[PDB]
Each structure stands twice: as C-alpha cells, then as structure tokens.
Curated annotation (Swiss-Prot):
It holds the Pfam family Lys. Lysozyme C is capable of both hydrolysis and transglycosylation; it also shows a slight esterase activity. It acts rapidly on both peptide-substituted and unsubstituted peptidoglycan, and slowly on chitin oligosaccharides. This is Lysozyme C, milk isozyme. PANTHER family: LYSOZYME C (PTHR11407), LYSOZYME C, MILK ISOZYME (PTHR11407:SF69). It comes from Canis lupus familiaris. Signal peptide: none annotated. GO terms for molecular function: lysozyme activity; metal ion binding. Keywords: Antimicrobial, Bacteriolytic enzyme, Calcium, Disulfide bond, Glycosidase, Hydrolase, Metal-binding, Milk protein.
C-alpha cells in the first residue's frame, strides 16, 4: 500500500518524462491523479459507467486499457488490470502515456475534465521542489 503526497508524485512523474508529454504539463498529470484516486496506488472503482472497473492511481478502466477476468476488454495497454494495484506505478505511467495518444487526450480521465481542465494550475506545484 502507498499513497503519494502531491510533490512526491510530481518528482516521480517528472523523472519518467511526463512534464510536457504530448503537450500536457506536469501539473495536469498530478492534478488528474489527485482527483481520480487522491494519490492512492490501490484505488479501485467497482462499477464505472460500464460494467467495468477502474484501477490504481490513474484509475485505468478494464473495458479499454487492461485485461481482467471479469469481462472482455480492448486491453490497449496489454496488461492485467491487477498490475495497477501495486505500490510501484511504472506500469501505470507507461499505460497513461498510451492513453493520451488517442484523440481525446487527457479527456479520457473524467475527473481531470471536471476538476483540472477548468482550473488555473499556475501555482498548483509552486510548493514543490522540482
């Protein structure tokens, strides 16, 4: 079990080349995590808008991004959803990079659309050492 703090996640994502990935600033990535899972690596949403489930710190869905025994999936990240429930988030990050390459970009994450896209994030990471 692991629950990141904002700046710690920011440092981790920056080290994995997320700042500016596909044009999305680091603040956008961290804000998405804050609202999707509140930085909890073991976050789990049972019934999403689909009979699917959302897994991990980035709440990746089982109908499109990963495989689960519960039902069929597009499995675009080619991986078992349970791999997104561990303390290490390197796999989650690799999948997140694949997700934003699609047309919707970060709008694939509804919590980001509702709580981050419309916010002024200029000082969101101002208290961090980047």
């Amino acid at each position: 079990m692991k629950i990141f703090s904002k700046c710690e996640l920011a440092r981790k994502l920056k080290s994995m080349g997320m700042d500016g990935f596909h044009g999305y600033s680091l603040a956008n990535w961290v804000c998405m995590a804050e609202y999707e899972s509140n930085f909890n690596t073991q976050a789990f949403n049972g019934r999403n808008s689909n009979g699917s489930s959302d897994y991990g710190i980035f709440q990746l869905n089982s109908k499109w991004w990963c495989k689960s025994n519960s039902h069929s999936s597009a499995n675009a990240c080619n991986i078992m959803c349970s791999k997104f429930l561990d303390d290490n988030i390197d796999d989650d990050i690799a999948c997140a990079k694949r997700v934003v390459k699609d047309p919707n970009g970060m709008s694939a994450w509804v919590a980001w659309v509702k709580h981050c896209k419309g916010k002024d994030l200029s000082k969101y990471l101002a208290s961090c050492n980047l």
